[PDB]
Coordinates of C-alpha atoms in Angstrom, one line a residue:
Chain A
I1 CA -121.6 -33.5 40.8
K2 CA -120.7 -30.6 43.1
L3 CA -117.4 -32.1 43.8
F4 CA -116.1 -31.5 40.2
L5 CA -118.1 -28.2 40.0
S6 CA -115.2 -26.2 42.3
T7 CA -111.8 -26.7 42.7
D8 CA -112.4 -27.2 46.6
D9 CA -108.7 -26.1 46.4
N10 CA -109.5 -23.3 48.4
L11 CA -108.3 -23.4 52.2
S12 CA -112.0 -23.0 53.7
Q13 CA -118.7 -11.1 56.4
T14 CA -115.1 -12.3 55.2
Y15 CA -113.9 -9.6 57.2
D16 CA -115.1 -8.5 61.0
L17 CA -114.6 -5.0 61.1
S18 CA -116.4 -2.3 63.2
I19 CA -118.0 0.5 61.8
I20 CA -115.4 3.2 62.0
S21 CA -113.4 0.5 60.8
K22 CA -115.4 0.2 57.2
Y23 CA -115.1 3.7 56.5
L24 CA -111.4 3.7 57.0
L25 CA -110.7 1.1 54.5
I26 CA -112.9 2.7 52.0
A27 CA -111.9 6.0 52.6
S28 CA -108.1 4.6 51.8
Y29 CA -108.8 2.8 48.3
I30 CA -110.1 6.7 47.1
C31 CA -106.8 7.6 47.9
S32 CA -105.0 4.9 46.3
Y33 CA -106.8 4.9 42.7
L34 CA -107.9 8.5 42.8
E35 CA -105.6 11.4 41.5
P36 CA -104.9 14.3 44.0
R37 CA -106.2 16.5 41.3
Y38 CA -109.9 15.1 42.0
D39 CA -109.9 15.3 45.4
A40 CA -111.5 19.0 45.8
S41 CA -113.4 18.6 42.5
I42 CA -115.5 15.7 44.0
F43 CA -115.3 16.1 47.6
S44 CA -115.9 19.8 48.5
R45 CA -118.7 21.7 47.8
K46 CA -117.1 24.8 46.0
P47 CA -107.5 2.4 36.4
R48 CA -109.3 -0.9 38.2
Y49 CA -106.5 -3.2 36.9
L50 CA -103.4 -0.8 37.7
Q51 CA -101.5 -1.0 41.2
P52 CA -102.6 1.3 43.7
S53 CA -100.4 4.2 44.4
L54 CA -99.4 5.8 47.8
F55 CA -100.9 8.6 49.5
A56 CA -100.3 10.4 52.6
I57 CA -101.7 10.0 55.8
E58 CA -103.4 13.2 56.0
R59 CA -105.4 12.5 52.5
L60 CA -106.9 9.4 54.6
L61 CA -108.1 11.0 57.4
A62 CA -109.8 14.2 55.2
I63 CA -111.4 11.6 52.9
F64 CA -112.7 9.7 56.0
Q65 CA -114.0 12.7 57.3
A66 CA -115.7 13.8 54.0
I67 CA -117.8 10.6 53.4
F68 CA -118.4 9.5 57.5
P69 CA -122.1 10.1 58.1
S70 CA -122.0 16.8 63.0
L71 CA -118.0 16.1 62.4
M72 CA -116.9 12.8 63.2
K73 CA -113.2 14.1 64.5
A74 CA -110.0 11.7 65.2
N75 CA -110.5 10.0 68.6
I76 CA -108.2 7.4 69.5
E77 CA -110.5 4.6 68.3
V78 CA -110.4 6.0 64.9
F79 CA -106.2 5.8 65.1
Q80 CA -106.9 2.6 67.1
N81 CA -108.7 1.3 64.5
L82 CA -106.2 2.7 61.6
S83 CA -103.3 0.7 63.3
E84 CA -105.3 -2.7 63.1
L85 CA -105.6 -2.8 59.8
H86 CA -101.9 -2.1 59.4
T87 CA -101.4 -4.9 61.8
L88 CA -104.2 -7.0 60.0
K89 CA -102.1 -5.9 56.6
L90 CA -105.5 -4.6 54.6
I91 CA -102.8 -1.4 54.4
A92 CA -99.3 -1.5 53.5
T93 CA -96.6 0.8 54.2
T94 CA -93.3 2.2 52.6
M95 CA -90.8 0.0 54.6
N96 CA -89.5 -3.7 55.9
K97 CA -86.7 -2.8 58.4
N98 CA -87.6 -1.1 61.9
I99 CA -91.0 -0.1 61.2
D100 CA -91.3 3.5 62.8
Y101 CA -94.9 4.8 61.7
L102 CA -94.4 8.4 63.2
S103 CA -91.3 9.0 60.8
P104 CA -92.4 11.6 58.1
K105 CA -91.2 9.5 55.1
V106 CA -92.9 6.8 55.2
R107 CA -96.3 6.5 52.6
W108 CA -99.3 4.4 52.8
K109 CA -101.2 2.1 50.2
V110 CA -104.0 0.2 49.6
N111 CA -103.4 -3.8 50.3
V112 CA -107.2 -4.7 49.7
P113 CA -108.4 -5.4 45.9
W114 CA -111.5 -4.1 44.6
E115 CA -114.2 -7.3 45.0
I116 CA -113.9 -7.4 48.5
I117 CA -114.4 -3.4 49.1
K118 CA -117.5 -3.8 46.9
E119 CA -119.1 -5.9 49.5
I120 CA -117.9 -4.0 52.1
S121 CA -119.9 -0.7 50.7
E122 CA -123.1 -3.0 50.4
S123 CA -123.3 -3.3 54.0
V124 CA -122.4 0.1 54.6
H125 CA -124.8 1.6 51.8
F126 CA -122.2 3.9 50.4
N127 CA -122.3 4.2 46.6
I128 CA -118.2 3.6 45.7
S129 CA -119.2 3.0 42.2
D130 CA -120.5 6.1 41.2
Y131 CA -117.3 7.8 42.3
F132 CA -115.3 6.5 38.7
Chain B
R1 CA -115.7 30.2 86.5
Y2 CA -112.3 28.4 86.0
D3 CA -111.8 25.9 88.6
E4 CA -114.9 23.7 87.1
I5 CA -113.7 24.3 83.6
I6 CA -110.2 22.9 84.3
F7 CA -111.5 19.9 86.3
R8 CA -113.9 19.3 83.4
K9 CA -111.2 19.7 80.8
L10 CA -108.8 17.3 83.2
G11 CA -111.1 15.1 83.9
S12 CA -111.1 14.8 87.2
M13 CA -113.8 13.3 89.4
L14 CA -113.6 16.5 91.9
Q15 CA -116.2 18.2 89.4
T16 CA -119.8 17.4 90.3
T17 CA -121.7 15.5 88.1
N18 CA -125.2 17.1 86.9
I19 CA -127.4 14.6 87.3
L20 CA -129.1 16.3 90.5
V21 CA -130.4 20.0 90.7
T22 CA -127.4 22.5 91.5
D23 CA -127.2 23.7 95.0
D24 CA -128.0 27.3 93.8
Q25 CA -131.1 26.3 91.9
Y26 CA -132.5 24.0 94.8
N27 CA -131.8 27.2 97.2
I28 CA -133.1 29.3 94.7
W29 CA -136.2 27.6 94.5
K30 CA -136.8 26.7 98.2
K31 CA -136.1 30.4 99.0
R32 CA -139.0 31.6 96.9
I33 CA -141.8 29.4 97.9
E34 CA -140.6 29.7 101.4
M35 CA -140.9 33.9 101.0
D36 CA -144.0 33.4 99.6
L37 CA -144.8 30.5 102.0
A38 CA -145.7 32.2 105.1
Chain C
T1 CA -112.7 21.2 58.9
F2 CA -111.6 18.7 56.4
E3 CA -112.6 21.3 53.3
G4 CA -110.0 23.4 54.5
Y5 CA -107.5 20.4 53.4
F6 CA -108.9 20.1 50.1
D7 CA -108.6 23.8 49.7
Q8 CA -104.6 24.0 49.6
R9 CA -88.3 32.3 46.2
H10 CA -87.1 33.1 49.8
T11 CA -84.2 31.7 51.5
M12 CA -83.2 31.5 55.1
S13 CA -80.0 33.3 54.6
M14 CA -82.0 36.4 54.2
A15 CA -82.7 36.3 57.9
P16 CA -79.9 37.0 60.2
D17 CA -77.9 34.6 61.7
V18 CA -77.7 33.8 65.2
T19 CA -74.9 31.8 66.8
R20 CA -75.8 28.7 68.8
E21 CA -75.0 30.3 72.0
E22 CA -76.8 33.4 71.5
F23 CA -79.8 31.4 70.6
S24 CA -79.6 29.8 73.7
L25 CA -79.7 33.2 75.9
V26 CA -82.9 34.7 74.8
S27 CA -84.6 31.1 75.5
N28 CA -83.8 30.9 78.8
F29 CA -84.5 34.1 80.0
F30 CA -88.0 33.9 78.3
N31 CA -88.6 30.6 79.8
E32 CA -88.6 31.7 83.5
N33 CA -89.7 35.6 83.3
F34 CA -92.5 34.9 80.6
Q35 CA -95.8 33.4 81.9
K36 CA -93.8 32.6 85.2
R37 CA -96.6 32.5 87.4
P38 CA -99.8 31.3 85.4
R39 CA -98.1 28.2 84.9
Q40 CA -96.7 27.8 88.3
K41 CA -100.1 28.2 89.4
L42 CA -101.6 25.6 87.1
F43 CA -99.0 23.2 88.2
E44 CA -99.9 23.7 91.7
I45 CA -103.9 23.3 90.9
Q46 CA -102.9 20.2 88.9
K47 CA -101.1 18.7 92.4
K48 CA -104.7 18.2 93.5
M49 CA -104.8 14.9 91.3
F50 CA -101.9 12.7 93.4
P51 CA -104.9 11.1 94.7
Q52 CA -106.5 9.7 91.8
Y53 CA -103.4 9.5 90.2
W54 CA -102.3 6.8 93.2
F55 CA -106.0 5.1 93.3
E56 CA -106.0 4.5 89.2
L57 CA -102.6 3.2 90.0
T58 CA -103.0 0.7 92.6
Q59 CA -106.5 -0.6 90.7
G60 CA -103.8 -1.7 87.9
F61 CA -104.3 1.3 85.1
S62 CA -101.4 3.0 83.4
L63 CA -101.3 6.8 83.1
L64 CA -100.5 8.3 80.1
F65 CA -99.3 12.0 80.5
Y66 CA -100.1 14.2 76.7
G67 CA -100.4 17.8 75.8
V68 CA -98.8 20.8 75.0
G69 CA -95.5 21.5 77.0
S70 CA -92.6 19.3 78.3
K71 CA -93.6 16.9 81.0
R72 CA -90.4 15.5 82.2
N73 CA -90.6 17.6 85.7
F74 CA -93.9 17.0 85.9
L75 CA -93.6 13.1 86.2
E76 CA -90.1 13.5 88.4
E77 CA -92.4 15.4 91.0
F78 CA -95.4 12.3 91.0
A79 CA -93.1 9.6 91.1
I80 CA -90.4 10.7 93.8
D81 CA -92.2 12.9 96.1
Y82 CA -95.4 11.4 96.2
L83 CA -96.1 7.7 94.7
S84 CA -92.8 6.2 96.1
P85 CA -93.0 7.2 99.8
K86 CA -96.8 6.8 99.9
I87 CA -96.8 3.3 98.9
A88 CA -93.8 2.2 101.3
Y89 CA -95.3 3.8 104.4
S90 CA -98.8 2.5 103.5
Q91 CA -98.3 -0.9 102.4
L92 CA -96.6 -1.8 105.8
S93 CA -88.5 2.8 99.6
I94 CA -89.9 1.4 96.5
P95 CA -87.6 1.9 93.3
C96 CA -87.9 4.2 90.8
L97 CA -87.1 3.6 87.0
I98 CA -86.6 6.5 85.1
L99 CA -85.9 5.9 81.2
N100 CA -85.3 8.5 78.9
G101 CA -86.7 8.2 75.1
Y102 CA -85.9 11.5 74.0
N103 CA -82.2 10.6 73.7
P104 CA -81.6 8.7 70.6
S105 CA -79.1 6.4 72.0
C106 CA -81.3 4.8 73.8
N107 CA -81.2 0.8 73.8
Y108 CA -84.0 -1.9 74.7
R109 CA -81.6 -4.4 75.6
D110 CA -79.8 -2.4 78.1
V111 CA -83.1 -1.4 80.1
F112 CA -84.0 -4.6 80.3
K113 CA -80.8 -5.5 82.2
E114 CA -82.2 -3.4 84.8
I115 CA -85.5 -5.0 84.8
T116 CA -84.1 -8.7 85.0
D117 CA -82.0 -7.4 88.3
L118 CA -84.6 -5.4 90.2
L119 CA -87.6 -7.9 89.4
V120 CA -86.2 -11.5 88.5
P121 CA -84.6 -13.6 91.1
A122 CA -81.5 -15.3 90.0
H123 CA -84.9 -13.5 73.2
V124 CA -86.0 -10.9 75.7
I125 CA -89.5 -12.1 75.6
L126 CA -89.1 -15.3 76.6
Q127 CA -87.4 -14.0 79.8
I128 CA -90.7 -11.8 80.1
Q129 CA -93.3 -14.7 79.9
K130 CA -91.3 -16.2 83.1
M131 CA -92.0 -13.0 85.0
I132 CA -95.9 -13.2 84.2
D133 CA -95.7 -17.3 85.3
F134 CA -93.6 -15.8 88.3
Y135 CA -95.7 -12.8 89.6
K136 CA -99.1 -14.8 89.0
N137 CA -98.7 -16.5 92.7
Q138 CA -96.9 -13.5 93.9
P139 CA -99.1 -11.2 96.2
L140 CA -100.5 -8.2 94.3
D141 CA -98.2 -5.4 96.2
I142 CA -96.5 -2.9 94.1
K143 CA -92.3 -3.6 93.9
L144 CA -91.1 -1.1 91.1
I145 CA -92.0 2.1 89.7
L146 CA -91.1 2.8 85.8
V147 CA -91.7 5.8 84.3
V148 CA -91.3 6.0 80.6
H149 CA -90.8 9.5 79.5
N150 CA -91.2 10.4 75.6
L151 CA -92.9 6.6 74.8
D152 CA -92.5 8.6 71.3
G153 CA -89.0 9.4 71.7
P154 CA -87.0 8.2 68.2
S155 CA -85.2 5.2 69.4
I156 CA -88.5 4.1 71.7
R157 CA -90.8 4.6 68.4
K158 CA -89.6 1.5 67.2
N159 CA -92.1 -1.5 67.5
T160 CA -89.6 -4.1 69.1
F161 CA -89.5 -1.5 71.9
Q162 CA -93.2 -0.9 71.8
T163 CA -93.5 -4.7 72.1
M164 CA -91.5 -4.7 75.3
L165 CA -93.1 -2.0 77.3
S166 CA -96.5 -3.4 76.3
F167 CA -95.8 -6.9 77.8
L168 CA -94.7 -5.3 81.3
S169 CA -98.0 -3.9 82.4
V170 CA -99.8 -7.3 82.4
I171 CA -97.5 -7.9 85.5
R172 CA -99.7 -6.3 88.4
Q173 CA -96.9 -5.5 90.5
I174 CA -95.2 -3.0 88.0
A175 CA -96.4 0.4 88.1
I176 CA -96.1 2.2 84.4
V177 CA -95.9 6.2 83.7
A178 CA -95.6 7.7 80.3
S179 CA -95.5 10.4 78.7
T180 CA -96.1 11.4 74.7
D181 CA -95.9 14.8 72.3
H182 CA -96.8 13.3 68.9
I183 CA -100.2 13.9 68.0
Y184 CA -100.3 10.5 66.0
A185 CA -98.8 8.6 69.3
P186 CA -102.3 6.8 69.5
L187 CA -101.8 5.0 66.1
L188 CA -98.5 3.4 67.6
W189 CA -100.8 1.0 69.7
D190 CA -103.6 -1.5 68.0
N191 CA -105.9 -3.2 70.0
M192 CA -103.3 -6.1 71.0
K193 CA -101.1 -3.3 72.7
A194 CA -103.5 -0.7 74.2
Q195 CA -105.3 -3.8 75.8
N196 CA -101.7 -4.6 77.6
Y197 CA -101.1 -1.1 78.3
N198 CA -104.8 -0.4 80.2
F199 CA -103.9 3.2 79.9
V200 CA -105.9 5.9 81.7
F201 CA -105.6 9.5 79.8
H202 CA -105.4 12.9 81.4
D203 CA -104.6 15.5 79.3
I204 CA -101.8 17.4 81.1
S205 CA -100.8 20.4 78.4
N206 CA -98.6 23.0 80.6
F207 CA -97.0 24.6 77.8
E208 CA -93.7 23.9 79.9
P209 CA -90.6 24.6 77.3
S210 CA -88.8 21.1 76.5
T211 CA -85.0 22.8 77.1
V212 CA -83.7 19.1 77.9
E213 CA -85.1 17.2 74.9
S214 CA -83.7 20.0 72.9
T215 CA -80.2 19.3 73.6
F216 CA -80.2 16.1 71.3
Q217 CA -81.1 18.1 68.2
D218 CA -79.0 21.2 66.9
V219 CA -81.4 24.1 66.2
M220 CA -78.0 25.3 63.5
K221 CA -79.3 22.6 60.9
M222 CA -82.8 24.8 60.6
Chain D
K1 CA -163.4 29.4 35.4
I2 CA -161.0 28.5 38.2
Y3 CA -159.0 31.4 39.4
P4 CA -157.9 30.2 43.6
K5 CA -156.8 32.9 45.7
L6 CA -154.1 32.9 48.7
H7 CA -154.0 33.5 52.2
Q8 CA -150.5 34.3 54.0
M9 CA -151.0 31.2 56.3
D10 CA -148.2 29.4 55.2
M11 CA -145.6 32.1 54.7
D12 CA -143.1 31.0 57.1
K13 CA -143.2 27.4 55.5
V14 CA -142.5 28.9 51.9
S15 CA -140.2 31.5 53.2
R16 CA -137.8 29.3 54.8
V17 CA -137.8 26.5 52.3
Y18 CA -136.7 29.7 49.9
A19 CA -133.7 30.6 51.8
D20 CA -132.7 26.8 52.6
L21 CA -132.3 26.4 49.0
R22 CA -130.4 29.6 48.7
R23 CA -127.8 28.7 51.1
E24 CA -127.3 25.2 49.7
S25 CA -126.6 26.6 46.1
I26 CA -124.0 29.5 47.2
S27 CA -121.2 27.6 46.4
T28 CA -122.7 24.9 44.3
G29 CA -122.8 24.4 40.7
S30 CA -126.2 24.2 40.3
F31 CA -129.5 26.1 38.8
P32 CA -129.7 29.7 39.2
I33 CA -131.6 29.9 42.3
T34 CA -133.6 33.2 42.5
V35 CA -136.8 35.1 43.0
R36 CA -138.2 33.6 39.4
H37 CA -137.7 30.3 40.8
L38 CA -139.8 31.2 44.2
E39 CA -142.5 32.3 41.8
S40 CA -143.0 28.8 40.5
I41 CA -143.8 27.2 43.7
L42 CA -146.5 29.5 44.1
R43 CA -147.7 29.3 40.5
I44 CA -147.2 25.4 40.4
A45 CA -149.2 25.5 43.8
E46 CA -152.2 27.4 42.0
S47 CA -151.9 24.6 39.5
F48 CA -153.0 22.1 42.3
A49 CA -155.4 23.8 43.4
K50 CA -156.9 24.8 40.5
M51 CA -156.9 20.9 39.6
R52 CA -159.1 20.5 42.6
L53 CA -161.6 23.2 41.1
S54 CA -161.0 25.2 45.0
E55 CA -161.0 28.7 45.2
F56 CA -158.5 28.8 48.0
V57 CA -154.8 27.9 48.1
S58 CA -155.0 25.5 51.0
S59 CA -151.9 24.2 53.1
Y60 CA -152.0 20.7 51.4
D61 CA -151.4 22.5 48.0
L62 CA -148.1 24.1 49.3
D63 CA -147.3 20.8 50.7
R64 CA -147.5 18.9 47.0
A65 CA -145.6 22.4 45.8
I66 CA -142.6 22.4 47.8
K67 CA -141.9 18.6 47.0
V68 CA -142.1 19.1 43.9
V69 CA -139.7 22.4 43.8
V70 CA -137.5 21.3 46.0
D71 CA -137.1 17.8 44.8
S72 CA -135.9 19.2 41.5
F73 CA -133.4 21.2 42.9
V74 CA -131.9 18.3 45.1
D75 CA -131.8 15.9 42.1
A76 CA -129.9 17.8 39.7
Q77 CA -126.7 17.8 42.0
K78 CA -123.6 15.9 41.6
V79 CA -122.8 12.3 43.3
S80 CA -121.3 13.5 46.2
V81 CA -123.3 16.4 47.3
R82 CA -126.6 14.6 46.2
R83 CA -126.6 12.4 49.1
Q84 CA -125.9 14.6 51.6
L85 CA -128.6 17.5 50.6
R86 CA -131.3 14.7 50.8
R87 CA -130.9 14.4 54.5
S88 CA -130.6 18.2 54.7
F89 CA -134.4 18.5 53.5
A90 CA -136.0 16.2 54.9
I91 CA -138.4 18.5 56.4
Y92 CA -139.6 19.0 53.5

């Protein structure tokens, strides 16, 4: 019975990521789907079907610092994990030839769907669902 | 003090590590008791 | 703080225009006269780290120089005057290879030609693979000193160039010294490159003016 | 019949709570935390004391009083800020 109930055309904790890595991806999805208008309204103390929009690297670090469990700061490990995600292709850039990260015109976007990030937040105890 | 600060900022191993009591503090501790010892 | 990021018709013609030759005048005089002694005093104090740098290099740890200010002159003094003579006069004249990253005309293939001639006894990565298998049986003796100024250089930032330099540090018989200026430089390296580079980090900020690197980009465009 | 009285032993406990609540409402859209809001802590402490028929406002009565009053201000906050004040006032 169990053979027919699943297609089994699938090739087969889905993504082993560090604590720094998990919050890095969580912060990016907010950037790719929340308008820049709402950055100050929600995070400062003062669309699920659409394709993600681009964002700047400064937006990512600010939100990552804003939700990380006093400040976390940006050491080498944070950037080391961020670059790996690009190498792991969970985050895309606006280029295809002669990749140069430090060129200012390159932008970033999220390559991870909603369903994967849903399960990531569960292991983090971060309630993303209340931000939309 | 300035040399200790620059050594710490540069990460040099010349700067001493504060796991033991400092020489000045232990010298003061020894002397304040030696003066009242005899 | 991060909250400082969320909380955020004049033209340059209104400013007095300065010719290119006039620009070099004021810069040269103040770079020498202003903050002369304290920077030299800091430089002389920083020379005391040569034994630690020399010790770290022998163990197989690459040295990365970062901070505010130019670092070309500091690397020149360390490798030529202290590093190269001491190794020869203690292991018993070691060649030193200097690569400029601030020059946008640099080519990786031209650089690799020097590496092959100086190290390989007579598709760049395939040749590098051969070198690793060769130096495994070779004695762990430093043979060539490599200095890479501006590892964040415009022609050096590219992924292909970064991969070539990263594979070199696997061979223990090569000494690597590098300097960077971009703030997001660590973003250029993931685990696969950081492991290969095997860096030991030193903040060497000196506020030394970058006269040499300023030559390759015109200030008149500003 | 019951009119419990007060002794100023827990003054530091209440005063610092009052200062703490005011500090977190200086730049957040929230309740108008004022002197009238502090009086609720003391009066609601009187009710707890007057439930035991005791004549004295004990330390425990203020402990129930402070928890009820502070939790109200924490609960009526936006989601992004609520989780932060959750841990900032864990002493109370």
